[PDB]
Amino acid sequence: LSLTNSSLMPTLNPMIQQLALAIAASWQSLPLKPYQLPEDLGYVEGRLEGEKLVIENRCYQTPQFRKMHLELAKVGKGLDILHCVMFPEPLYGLPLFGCNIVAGPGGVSAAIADLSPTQSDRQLPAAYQKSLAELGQPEFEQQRELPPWGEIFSEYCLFIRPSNVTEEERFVQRVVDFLQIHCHQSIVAEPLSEAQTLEHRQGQIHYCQQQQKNDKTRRVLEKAFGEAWAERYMSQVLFDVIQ
Ligand SMILES: C=CC1=C(C)/C(=C/c2[nH]c(/C=C3N=C(/C=C4\NC(=O)C(C)=C4C=C)C(C)=C\3CCC(=O)O)c(CCC(=O)O)c2C)NC1=O
């Protein structure tokens, strides 16, 4: 988890480096246990007719978080990617923390982060709404509109092309704030009823089914590994549907 053993870290975009470190720092003192990904995946690389894709995976769990997945990736020399989801244990009804940063030699092209709902009413729990509203509306110059499958994201979702260093840092600090709120709520969360647990499970299943519609992610995987490998990776590794 220190990321000192990461082969990719030294070479990734600096915003991706700071976010990876912030996430790792948020997790470091938790009652972590390993989470074995399919085939006990760690590092993986592939190439077909174009550029190589290299991926590093770290994954944990705690009693509140079913699966805590931090992934770093690079395609050839251009394209750097950070992907992170904290999948909640439905028993506790926490939202889904998620982040995706994509960067090229021209800087960060996409920075996305959210705490996504799992309630059937599509709202975050009241304590989250309150804490998030207190952060205030962050100003970013270059907002990006979510695709239709993006209905899963909350009203606090960030999706921008950072314009400059000030904005990169403002985005990273907002992610730190989201992680601080989320880790705090995890300690105050009580186990829920069977009907509420079920309702939260359904929201997490929906979230994964929608995230699988991301053709931008799927194309990157397909270009290095092929269609069948990409379908397995998106459905079993990135956005597994619980059951
Ligand atoms: C191997 C992993 C992995 C890869 C290969 C990947 C690729 C990837 N995701 C993208 C966008 C995107 N990614 C997301 C969102 C997310 N994606 C997530 O994995 C999570 C957790 C969220 C949100 C919290 C969204 C909303 C877009 C834009 C999709 C579109 O523009 O149609 C893009 C286009 C970036 C851009 O337009 O500037 C690429 C190349 N993302 C990854 O995670």
Curated annotation (Swiss-Prot):
List, in alphabetical order, the Gene Ontology terms for molecular function in this entry: cobalt ion binding; phycocyanobilin:ferredoxin oxidoreductase activity
Which key words are in the record? Oxidoreductase
Enzyme Commission code:
1.3.7.5
Question: Which BP terms does GO give this entry?
Answer: phytochromobilin biosynthetic process
Q: Answer yes or no on keyword Oxidoreductase.
A: yes
Domain of life, per lineage: Bacteria
Catalytic activity of the protein:
(2R,3Z)-phycocyanobilin + 4 oxidized [2Fe-2S]-[ferredoxin] = biliverdin IXalpha + 4 reduced [2Fe-2S]-[ferredoxin] + 4 H(+)
Residue spans crossing the bilayer? none
Function statement: Catalyzes the four-electron reduction of biliverdin IX-alpha (2-electron reduction at both the A and D rings); the reaction proceeds via an isolatable 2-electron intermediate, 181,182-dihydrobiliverdin.
Could you say which protein family the record assigns here? Belongs to the HY2 family.
Name by which UniProt lists this protein = Phycocyanobilin:ferredoxin oxidoreductase
Q: Which gene encodes it?
A: pcyA
